[PDB]
């Protein structure tokens, strides 16, 4: 059984209200990983056990170049630990915040890798439900790594539906802001928002009041910069179609609609998945412990330490299963 003191703890990469994520060195190999450490007490109190269990179980079987690979999943008496591959390039949120906007070409490169990963997940009857800039990360080479599978749902094929009101406010598809159930098209809306941000340099809809924000998502027309290309406008219009049945990717072919769209005219999708494409930006990391593409807000912080209490789908190892 794997435990806490099997790792060195180096720097805080991100912090949440459930727990924290830390850069660690595996003592027995000397290799570097990211570790997400959640507190069981907070999870149980929020009744978010199924979701946290889902996150591990989905990671235990998924394999794709643009999904973060899980090395270990273990637990202590009061903590849950995910140990995954360290994305040296940091969050896409960090980069877009620093650069303000990406070119259509650069956005096309990232979008193609997100689409490839979404096709894969949807083919496995998995709906990701939380596509956003914070959950898209770059590895050392500059390829996309989707992270955070805490709001995944399984067993969702064709027009299967879901009932949990969850996601991230600013990224919620309009149908999720209605009563009753919604389908897997919400992921393609999610893509739409990140595509929109990458090319237009802001969220398509925003207000710090959620009541105001949810009204915008349901009621407001998206606007485009004039200089944006027609196929860029067409893609964003299609992905951000308020009606999921008319939305690009919302049909029975799922990812094929998005893949065949004219915005991706110059993309070979087999080249994408095989990593034959060259990242436009390459992280300039000078060592394994280099955390330049993470925020000082987190990395400057020092690292303190704040019966059958067992979670029944954890204790995983990539070497064993």
């Amino acid at each position: 059984k794997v435990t806490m003191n099997d790792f060195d703890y180096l720097k805080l990469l991100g912090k949440g209200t459930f727990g924290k994520v830390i850069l660690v060195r595996e003592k027995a190999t000397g290799r570097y990983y990211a570790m997400k450490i959640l507190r069981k007490e907070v999870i149980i109190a929020k009744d978010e056990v199924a979701h946290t269990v889902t996150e591990s179980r989905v990671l235990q079987n998924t394999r794709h170049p643009f999904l973060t690979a899980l090395k270990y999943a273990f637990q202590t008496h009061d903590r849950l630990c995910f140990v995954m591959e360290y994305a040296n390039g940091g969050e896409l949120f960090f980069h877009l915040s620093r650069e303000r906007v990406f070119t259509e070409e650069r956005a096309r490169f990232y979008g193609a890798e997100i689409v490839s990963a979404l096709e894969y997940l949807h083919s496995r009857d998995v709906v990701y439900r939380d596509i956003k800039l914070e959950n898209l990360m770059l590895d050392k080479d500059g390829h996309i790594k989707i992270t955070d599978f805490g709001l995944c749902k399984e067993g969702i094929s064709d027009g299967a539906t879901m009932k949990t009101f969850c996601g991230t406010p600013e990224y919620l598809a309009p149908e999720v802001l209605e009563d009753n159930d919604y389908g897997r098209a919400v992921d393609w809306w999610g893509l739409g928002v990140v595509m929109y941000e990458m090319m237009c340099g802001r969220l398509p809809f925003y207000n710090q009041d959620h009541e105001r924000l949810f009204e915008l998502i349901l009621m407001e027309e998206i606007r485009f910069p004039r200089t944006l290309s027609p196929e860029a406008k067409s893609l964003l219009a299609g992905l951000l179609k308020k009606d999921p049945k008319q939305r690009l990717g919302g049909g029975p072919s799922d990812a094929k609609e998005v893949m065949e769209h004219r915005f991706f005219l110059s993309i070979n999708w087999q080249d994408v998945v095989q990593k034959k494409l060259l990242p436009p930006f390459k992280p300039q990391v000078t060592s394994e412990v280099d955390t330049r593409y993470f925020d000082d807000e987190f990395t400057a912080q020092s690292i303190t330490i704040t019966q059958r209490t067992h979670f029944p789908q954890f204790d995983y190892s990539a070497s064993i299963r």
Partner: peptide, 10 residues
């Protein structure tokens, strides 16, 4: 640059 968003459930 927008502020950090936070995920939620039910």
């Amino acid at each position: 640059g927008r502020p950090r968003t936070t995920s939620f459930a039910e």
